[PDB]
Amino acid sequence: HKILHRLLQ
Amino acid sequence: MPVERILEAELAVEDPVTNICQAADKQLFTLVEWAKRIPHFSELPLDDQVILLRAGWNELLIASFSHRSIAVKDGILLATGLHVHRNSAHSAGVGAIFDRVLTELVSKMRDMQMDKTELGCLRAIVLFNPDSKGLSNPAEVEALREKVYASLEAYCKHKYPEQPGRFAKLLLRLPALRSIGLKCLEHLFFFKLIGDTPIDTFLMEMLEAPH
Numbered sequence: 012h013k014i015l016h017r018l019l020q
Numbered sequence: 021m022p023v024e025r026i027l028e029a030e031l032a033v034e035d036p037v038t039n040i041c042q043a044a045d046k047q048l049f050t051l052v053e054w055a056k057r058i059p060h061f062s063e064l065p066l067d068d069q070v071i072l073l074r075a076g077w078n079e080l081l082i083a084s085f086s087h088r089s090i091a092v093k094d095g096i097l098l099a100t101g102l103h104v105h106r107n108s109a110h111s112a113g114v115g116a117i118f119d120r121v122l123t124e125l126v127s128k129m130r131d132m133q134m135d136k137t138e139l140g141c142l143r144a145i146v147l148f149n150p151d152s153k154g155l156s157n158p159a160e161v162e163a164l165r166e167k168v169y170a171s172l173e174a175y176c177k178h179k180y181p182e183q184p185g186r187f188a189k190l191l192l193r194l195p196a197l198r199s200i201g202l203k204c205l206e207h208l209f210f211f212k213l214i215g216d217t218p219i220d221t222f223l224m225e226m227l228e229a230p231h
């Protein structure tokens with residue numbers, strides 16, 4: 012979920 | 021929950037198996053940007069935004085490429101610009117699921133001329149899935165879904181008044197979308213197991229177990 016969290020900023 | 025904002029979200033973001041997986045990884049980045057443009061999504065708690073996207077990403081992306089393919093005969097148009105014919109999919113070992121997409125989604129979208137507002141509303145309904153496990157407040161996601169399908173019904177009644185069954189027709193493509201989404205996931209996990217198909221970082225992360 013690392014990429015997904017970073018993109019949801 | 022104005023349908024105009026949902027249409028704006030759609031317009032803003034506009035071995036064959038290897039090409040398909042590459043396009044899917046590409047579109048996962050754009051999917052996040054789409055969700056941020058759906059009214060009230062970005063105001064949900066971050067953990068809930070993650071839950072909804074991890075629960076719906078595959079159905080959301082299948083609906084998108086299916087609608088993109090309405091003018092393609094017997095094939096699909098990848099987000100990379102590559103047309104893939106059903107003959108190519110069959111020759112690569114994924115003919116059955118490809119034919120399901122053509123017969124249950126693309127052809128039916130074509131036959132009723134589903135428009136981009138209706139597509140966006142169906143995708144927003146999928147996004148606001150109140151059955152997603154772990155949501156901090158499922159009732160608020162339920163409320164957002166209800167706002168979407170209320171706006172969709174009013175839109176269909178205003179724009180297509182001579183088609184009183186059209187709203188139900190749109191909603192009754194969601195079981196096929198759910199089933200095709202699950203079957204596509206089965207294939208991707210199998211490709212991952214066999215190891216003969218490149219899978220990029222974001223697609224791979226979506227295939228990870230949840231936290």
Ligand SMILES: Cc1c(C(=O)O)ccc2c1N[C@H](c1cc(C(F)(F)F)cc(C(F)(F)F)c1)[C@H]1[C@@H]3CC[C@@H](C3)[C@@H]21
Pocket residue numbers: 037040043044047077078079081082084085096097098099100109114117118119121204205207208
């Ligand atoms: C083409 C495309 C795009 C695009 O280009 O915009 C974006 C997302 C996806 C797809 N297509 C993928 C798929 C379709 C099929 C079918 F068309 F044959 F049904 C078979 C398989 C498989 F190879 F797995 F069998 C995979 C799906 C996958 C589920 C969510 C992503 C990945 C989703």
